[PDB]
Design a protein around this ligand. Structure first.
Ligand SMILES: C[C@@H]1O[C@@H](OCCCCC(=O)SCCNC(=O)CCNC(=O)[C@H](O)C(C)(C)COP(=O)(O)OP(=O)(O)OC[C@H]2O[C@@H](n3cnc4c(N)ncnc43)[C@H](O)[C@@H]2OP(=O)(O)O)[C@H](O)C[C@H]1O
Ligand SMILES: C[C@@H]1O[C@@H](OCCCCC(=O)SCCNC(=O)CCNC(=O)[C@H](O)C(C)(C)COP(=O)(O)OP(=O)(O)OC[C@H]2O[C@@H](n3cnc4c(N)ncnc43)[C@H](O)[C@@H]2OP(=O)(O)O)[C@H](O)C[C@H]1O
Ligand SMILES: Cc1cc2nc3c(=O)[nH]c(=O)nc-3n(C[C@H](O)[C@H](O)[C@H](O)COP(=O)(O)OP(=O)(O)OC[C@H]3O[C@@H](n4cnc5c(N)ncnc54)[C@H](O)[C@@H]3O)c2cc1C
Ligand SMILES: Cc1cc2nc3c(=O)[nH]c(=O)nc-3n(C[C@H](O)[C@H](O)[C@H](O)COP(=O)(O)OP(=O)(O)OC[C@H]3O[C@@H](n4cnc5c(N)ncnc54)[C@H](O)[C@@H]3O)c2cc1C
Ligand SMILES: Nc1ncnc2c1ncn2[C@@H]1O[C@H](COP(=O)(O)OP(=O)(O)OP(=O)(O)O)[C@@H](O)[C@H]1O
Ligand SMILES: Nc1ncnc2c1ncn2[C@@H]1O[C@H](COP(=O)(O)OP(=O)(O)OP(=O)(O)O)[C@@H](O)[C@H]1O
Ligand SMILES: [Mg+2]
Ligand SMILES: [Mg+2]
Lengths: 659, 662
């Protein structure tokens, strides 16, 4: 029962939707975590579709950079008016659906306000201070931003140049931007949108958070001591204004310092915040979240690609009278379905880490940590592998559309440009793979120390070493996938040890083995991704849904295993390698008739998809032409530039001498 | 290090003082000759004296229409200065001049030079060359290669644009019957060209002869208004290449003379007599020129990206090593050397691989001028996989180059995103990568399918290694690596062929048998071309005098063959131990550390001017932070302190929210 079937649909897609071996309302429920929310997405989408001003002013690719900032600002101010009609404002699941559909991904004045400004106020500012700002934030009375990275520093928060000196005479922090590289650089909404910022600065006590008003609340003119502006065009996310901040001995009250965990008293005593580095909690929320987000990004690209694949006919197989849908080719299925399997896998992996963090957030209001450290390390590699493999799959989804995928009419290049930033923001991907490697070394540096009973369930499989082998029913793959991770974990570990056993200093001994350590993190991460996927599948009550999700899961483990055979061949035969190589191509064929249904299940409205190639109704060619015909260069037959330059250049070129 | 200047950032100055070779010598190698390498600097110098040839403003700041305008502004000016600055019919020099002055984002004459002119050269009669080819070269007229339709790009056997000969008036009637039949994607088709080489199915009193080339005038040479029967426009914004106008073409029973059919190789006489061309597929010659060429070109884009990454990696200090005062240069980190230098090894490897296929194309272009065209099929298949693997790996490389700059890499001030957007199209144009990998796979089957027969002596030198057997395998000295790459390849080649064969002994039809083995066959193709890239590299370094250059290129080459071998270890473990895998793994890291001090020198050698580089992070002088600020401050969004859209939307929104109920 494909629920994305409508009248007037392209038969090419219709005949693909009648092939649905499951209910897509059922699958949406699984995808978005509950039957109730999956419904609410459709209700909201329907509620929005009946509000004309919430439509894109024109096709978003047709807009200039400034026209993009305007429209995102236009759309965010209108959305905010209707917001409390359409959703439960404090329901993040709904608010994300509403904004991802209505605003889009390219940015808006409130992006980082909701992404990091509010979540940090929730996890770092005293109940006193939350009363002063947190609801003013949620009421969008003010626009905030998370202002941490500097022009010279982003990855090493131990050497930020921005200063926060306390002057006990007047009980104020003087916040300064000493050097040019000390300038805040990259915070969303810092340059033009926000009038408040959470500025990270050196207190020497390390980096802390300071609420700083940047612009006057009524006039939006910057306050004395404030230099602010945009940082120019970017790879993408250009509807958002990422900016810089210059602070010239800026004075803020002592109580503009966030103090949930730490304290500075009026006389200047500093109460060290419980322990750990609790202030990095905001980053951890994002990192735990983007396994879900980059999962949905990927789903978006595949939704376009899969649908278009089922429409585009090119080349013949058998039957030399009608060309075949390109989705019938093995390479096509190969370059799409594993990534489709990944989309589901990353999202299920996302639900576990999302709940893990919102649970290990309450653990931090009790004096509990170290579930903190165990979560950080996991999401460290998780955001890295996921964003990297997502980016790979999106381009594959783009290129899979042939020539037209390169057109903005596909919109896959936008989804890539947005998503791929996840390989940089919220921690540089290499660095974050290394952070996880520090949790892996520790988990191994324990062999002669015993302490195997201290390991968490995530690291448990390390203090084992019970290889074996086999792969006749799923869990053997998982077993193989621990065996791979384990080996590389020890091997890379013992190599960093050996270079200390021969006396190269720790940090240099750490550097010489940096690549193997990252190789470990990825193997460990992809092991977890599989397990979470498995855990979600075996819970499903509806049998046809469990069935097709099993097909996806079989496809995952074999494509994944073969991508990492270089590590899997300590434990495998070469004949078994051709099994999983044959198994891969079996479930490609198995998935095929469900392909369109599997992406229809995500129930991404056309308003959110923003894709001509990926239109739900499948009327691609007719509307691709309309899209092109209405594009801005087609405003004039003979271009003003041609008349001015090319016409003279040609007249002149006819008269020139033959040398 | 010839890229050292006064006023340079000491960060980069101390990196260039570490040069263990001459960069004027390396440049000569990269560009194929000392004479040309010298010309590049000579042209760049002469260009730098002409103010009108500078970018009107930082290209990222430009709207899509302003980009078309600027490509048109700069190409009309450049055309005037063309005879001063270079030898017009020297393609090496013209490419340097345009890649630097114009750039990669497109101009009215891109495909005019890329395919329009090369197709006239290879497919038009001496008569027809007299009528147009010199007109094209003097840029009297603007042309294009109009092949791909809205519904057909890969499969040329079923294009819907017809070419019907009417013997009565001796004309071809050219028709676009359906909306999908519309030409779609030719550069300059929509707005710039007034002439187009239109590919259409040839019809002679219902006889179907396949796709052919027809010269079509589209716009009046005087008014640039389209002619009767012509529909033409732009196909909208794109992932990149947006200073160019890629267009669509609609033809309504457009009549052109019989002699607007490109003849040479083939003929249509006034009575309708069709004369078959010698080798059926002589017409795709324009495509093969591109494919042969982009190993070179997708070698240079990548170098361009690395020129920015490496330089910036030697400025950007972040994190601490041993000395816990003063942060370390990020280029010192292993992951950074690992995510950068192998691509640097590929950039060199691709370019040298490019020199070989460029030269034998333009010589197996003379083989097509009277006689044997056996090295036509052998070249097509080589360049089929070569463009696919190269463009794909150049893609991964260039993204790695961007992310290497961290946060700032995402900014347009790095320009690596542009370079990525431009080159990655190479995975699509000039043949869809999967389709092209499958094309070489057919040449691999047929090459294998010649050895259970006894025609191994029909094999070319490229395919030769397939009839052999290496069995015994080691390294210790390079040639053993090539021997290892001869395996895997040969291994998979047979392994994939016999699977496709078995499916036919299963009685599954060829097309379906081919389809079910399609992935294995592409694995075979990739392995084959990676072997070639390595050999090509080898043949270039073991040939040149100047030992410092031959030694740094040997360092690169060692890094290549070790990094590549590990990337394909899964195939290399039919022939290797495991302990040797740790050697090649150890060997990889040794040459990362060995290359490191030459890093800035190896890229400075490409002698890409700032004018061409168009990157703030990649500035030659190395003044990044100072100029990154200046750049941002000048960016268009900062024209006002309070945005018009903030005053109009955000201010009233905020007022309302404060007053609104709880
Ligand atoms: C529009 C929107 O767009 C998008 O929005 C998202 C945009 C996100 C906005 C941003 O980009 S802002 C921030 C992102 N930037 C970063 O992340 C880089 C920060 N990275 C670092 O700072 C370092 O790498 C660390 C992680 C090493 C932190 O360490 P240090 O401070 O520099 O110094 P040290 O004192 O040396 O720390 C190392 C030891 O401390 C332990 N440790 C570290 N972190 C934690 C932690 N979190 N919890 C517990 N323990 C920890 C650790 O054990 C280390 O010791 P041991 O490893 O030797 O054993 C979304 O799509 C969403 C969408 O809505
Ligand atoms: C700005 C600028 O940007 C950039 O500019 C570049 C832009 C480039 C402009 C374009 O994108 S336009 C054209 C690009 N499009 C393509 O390429 C797709 C064409 N692909 C095809 O058409 C098919 O895939 C082929 C290759 C299979 C051709 O075959 P069919 O016609 O469709 O039908 P059949 O009759 O079935 O052919 C198969 C049998 O024929 C044999 N054969 C095929 N090709 C050749 C050949 N070339 N030579 C010799 N033999 C050949 C072959 O043996 C087959 O038989 P066996 O395999 O079974 O044994 C640069 O950066 C440069 C920069 O300057
Ligand atoms: C779209 C986008 C949006 C952003 N939004 C915000 C925002 O709203 N608020 C905010 O505060 N910031 C924001 N940022 C900044 C971002 O958080 C930081 O840039 C990122 O966390 C780290 O980038 P970096 O400049 O520090 O890279 P770098 O730390 O300089 O690293 C660059 C290179 O050096 C390597 N490297 C650096 N250190 C090490 C090390 N110890 N070990 C091994 N390798 C190392 C890295 O692997 C990498 O290859 C944004 C960035 C982007 C791209
Ligand atoms: C920047 C750019 C510039 C261009 N410039 C020009 C120009 O100047 N002149 C011109 O004529 N054209 C031009 N083109 C068009 C280009 O030549 C075609 O887009 C390209 O050849 C790919 O063809 P396609 O669009 O039909 O891909 P498709 O065939 O539609 O690809 C769709 C999917 O199906 C797969 N597929 C298709 N056939 C098979 C098969 N037999 N077996 C297995 N898989 C298959 C493909 O691999 C792909 O994954 C340009 C394109 C781009 C992106
Ligand atoms: N030349 C290429 N151009 C574009 N995409 C490619 C290319 N080669 C591989 N891919 C893509 O990479 C993904 C991985 O597929 P595959 O494993 O066959 O390639 P690979 O891993 O690079 O090859 P191998 O596994 O033999 O090393 C596929 O989705 C495929 O579409
Ligand atoms: N999560 C990631 N984010 C960014 N880049 C990555 C990531 N994982 C791998 N890479 C890049 O891939 C390239 C080579 O991959 P790697 O060093 O892992 O070797 P590999 O053996 O081919 O991969 P694997 O270790 O997964 O088998 C490097 O340039 C590295 O930067
Ligand atoms: Mg890797
Ligand atoms: Mg693979």
């Amino acid at each position: 029962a494909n629920r994305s079937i409508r009248d007037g649909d392209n038969p090419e897609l219709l005949e693909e939707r009648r092939m649905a071996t499951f209910d897509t309302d059922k699958m949406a429920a699984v995808i978005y975590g509950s039957e109730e929310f999956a419904r609410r997405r459709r209700e909201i989408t329907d509620a929005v579709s009946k509000i004309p001003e919430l439509a894109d002013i024109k096709p978003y690719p047709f807009l200039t950079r400034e026209e993009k900032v305007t429209e995102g600002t236009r759309k965010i101010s209108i959305l905010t008016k209707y917001l409390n009609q359409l959703i439960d404002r404090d329901n993040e699941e709904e608010s994300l659906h509403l904004h991802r559909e209505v605003i889009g991904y390219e940015g808006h004045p409130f992006a980082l306000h909701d992404a990091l400004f509010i979540p940090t106020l929730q996890s770092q500012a005293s109940d006193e201070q939350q009363e002063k700002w947190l609801e003013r934030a949620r009421r969008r009375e003010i626009i905030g931003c998370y202002a941490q990275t500097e022009l010279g520093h982003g990855s090493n928060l131990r050497n930020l140049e921005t200063t926060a000196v306390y002057d006990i005479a007047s009980q104020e922090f003087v916040l300064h931007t000493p050097t040019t590289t000390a300038l805040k650089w990259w915070p969303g909404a810092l340059g033009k949108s926000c009038n408040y910022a959470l500025v990270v600065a050196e207190l020497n006590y390390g980096p802390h958070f300071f609420m700083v008003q940047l612009r006057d609340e009524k006039t939006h003119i910057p306050l004395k001591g404030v230099t602010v502006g945009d940082i120019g065009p970017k790879m993408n996310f250009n509807a958002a204004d990422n900016g810089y901040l210059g602070l010239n001995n800026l004075r803020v009250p002592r109580t503009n310092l966030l103090m949930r965990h730490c304290k500075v008293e009026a006389d200047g005593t500093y109460v060290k915040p419980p322990h750990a580095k609790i202030g990095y909690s905001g980053m951890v929320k994002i990192r735990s979240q983007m396994a879900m987000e980059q999962g949905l990004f990927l789903a978006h690209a595949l939704t376009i690609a899969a649908r278009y694949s089922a429409v585009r006919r090119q080349g013949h197989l058998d039957d030399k009278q009608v060309e075949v849908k390109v989705l019938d080719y093995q390479t096509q299925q190969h370059r799409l379905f594993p990534s489709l399997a990944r989309a589901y896998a990353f999202i299920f992996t996302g639900f576990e880490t999302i709940h893990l963090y919102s649970q290990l957030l309450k653990d931090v209001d009790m004096g509990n940590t170290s579930g903190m450290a165990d979560l950080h390390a996991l999401t460290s590699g998780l955001k890295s592998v996921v964003a990297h493999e997502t980016g790979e799959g999106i381009e594959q989804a783009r290129m899979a559309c042939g020539g037209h995928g390169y057109s903005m009419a596909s919109y896959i290049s936008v989804v890539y440009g947005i998503a791929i930033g996840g390989c940089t923001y919220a921690g540089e991907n290499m660095v974050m793979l290394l952070q996880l490697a520090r949790y892996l070394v520790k988990s191994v540096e324990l062999i002669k120390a015993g302490k195997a009973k201290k390991l968490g369930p995530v690291a448990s499989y390390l203090a084992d070493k019970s290889d074996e082998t086999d792969l006749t029913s799923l869990n053997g793959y998982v077993k193989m996938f621990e065996n791979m991770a384990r080996r590389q974990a020890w091997k890379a570990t013992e190599k960093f040890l050996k270079l200390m056993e021969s006396g190269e200093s720790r940090e240099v001994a750490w550097n010489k083995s940096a690549v193997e350590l990252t190789r470990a993190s990825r193997l460990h991460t992809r092991l977890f991704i599989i397990e979470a996927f498995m855990r979600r599948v075996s819970r499903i009550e509806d049998i046809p849904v469990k069935e097709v999700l099993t097909d996806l899961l079989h496809l995952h483990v074999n494509y994944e295993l073969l991508d990492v055979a270089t590590y899997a061949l300590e434990f495998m035969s070469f004949t078994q390698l051709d099994y999983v190589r044959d198994q891969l191509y079996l479930y490609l064929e198995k998935i095929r008739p469900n392909a369109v249904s599997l992406v229809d299940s995500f129930q991404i409205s056309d308003m959110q998809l923003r894709s001509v190639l990926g239109r739900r109704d499948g009327h691609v060619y007719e509307n691709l032409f309309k899209w092109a015909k209405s594009s801005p260069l087609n405003n004039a037959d003979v271009l003003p530039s041609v008349e001015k330059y090319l016409k003279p250049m040609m007249e002149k070129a006819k008269l020139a001498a033959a040398h």
